[PDB]
Amino acid sequence: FHFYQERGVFYAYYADVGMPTTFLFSLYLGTILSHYYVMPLTCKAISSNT
Amino acid sequence: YGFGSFNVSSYDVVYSDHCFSVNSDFCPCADPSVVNSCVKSKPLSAICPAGTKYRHCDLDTTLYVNNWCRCSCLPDPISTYSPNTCPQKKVVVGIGEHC
Amino acid sequence: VIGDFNCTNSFINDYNKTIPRISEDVVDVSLGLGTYY
Numbered sequence: 001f002h003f004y005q006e007r008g009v010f011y012a013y014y015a016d017v018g019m020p021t022t023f024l025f026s027l028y029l030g031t032i033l034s035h036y037y038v039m040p041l042t043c044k045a046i047s048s049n050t
Numbered sequence: 051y052g053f054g055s056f057n058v059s060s061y062d063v064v065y066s067d068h069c070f071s072v073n074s075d076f077c078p079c080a081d082p083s084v085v086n087s088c089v090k091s092k093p094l095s096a097i098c099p100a101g102t103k104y105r106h107c108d109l110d111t112t113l114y115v116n117n118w119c120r121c122s123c124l125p126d127p128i129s130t131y132s133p134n135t136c137p138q139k140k141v142v143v144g145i146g147e148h149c
Numbered sequence: 150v151i152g153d154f155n156c157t158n159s160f161i162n163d164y165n166k167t168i169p170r171i172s173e174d175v176v177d178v179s180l181g182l183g184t185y186y
């Protein structure tokens with residue numbers, strides 16, 4: 001994934017087959033994004049004991 | 051923080067002149083415990099949300115005046131021009147973006 | 150934190166100071182990793 005911002009606009013690129021990404025979408029916002037976060041995935045059975 | 055509206059006429063157009071930028075943990079309400087220690091020029095305080103940080107106040111002590119809370123942003127961010135101390139930093143609008 | 154709204158506060162481990170060591174890696178753009186069309 002590429003996620004960047006420029007002049008009010010937000011741009012997303014993605015790939016699943018291969019390393020270079022292709023264009024997914026853009027979105028006008030008018031504001032500046034300042035933070036991100038990756039959420040914790042509360043699963044049940046993915047761990048080392050599983 | 052409850053910007054409700056600007057009372058204007060029917061066909062008034064509003065324009066700004068001073069735009070300010072803050073961080074994303076900014077709270078103008080003071081701490082509700084350092085107000086329980088000061089006397090002179092006591093501030094207004096409340097509860098700030100989960101992640102924000104209150105306004106800092108110095109505990110100043112002199113020979114003419116006792117323990118007083120010397121906090122920032124005095125008189126106002128528009129006219130306080132020692133502006134490395136009030137968090138509302140002045141900005142200028144960029145292309146494509148709003149104030 | 151992330152939001153400022155108390156959805157649920159059951160099973161909250163608020164008594165800890167050990168920051169989890171996250172990980173590191175080195176980016177290598179030599180085969181095209183990091184580019185786009």
Ligand SMILES: *[C@@H]1O[C@H](CO)[C@@H](O)[C@H](O)[C@H]1NC(C)=O
Nearest residue numbers: 043044045046047048049050
């Ligand atoms: C999962 O990893 C543990 C770590 O030692 C190992 O003992 C266990 O046999 C592994 N189980 C499977 C199903 O791979």
Ligand SMILES: *[C@@H]1O[C@H](CO)[C@@H](O)[C@H](O)[C@H]1NC(C)=O
Nearest residue numbers: 054055056057058059060062
């Ligand atoms: C504008 O609205 C406020 C709140 O309703 C009111 O106090 C004020 O008097 C109004 N302005 C005028 C000129 O009436």
Ligand SMILES: *[C@@H]1O[C@H](CO)[C@@H](O)[C@H](O)[C@H]1NC(C)=O
Nearest residue numbers: 100154155156157158159161
């Ligand atoms: C958060 O909400 C839950 C509702 O289940 C409540 O039990 C808890 O007391 C709330 N936390 C605070 C700090 O009020």
Ligand SMILES: *[C@@H]1O[C@H](CO)[C@@H](O)[C@H](O)[C@H]1NC(C)=O
Nearest residue numbers: 162163164165166167168169
């Ligand atoms: C943090 O929690 C872990 C287990 O939950 C415990 O082993 C450790 O001693 C804790 N550290 C502190 C500083 O509380």
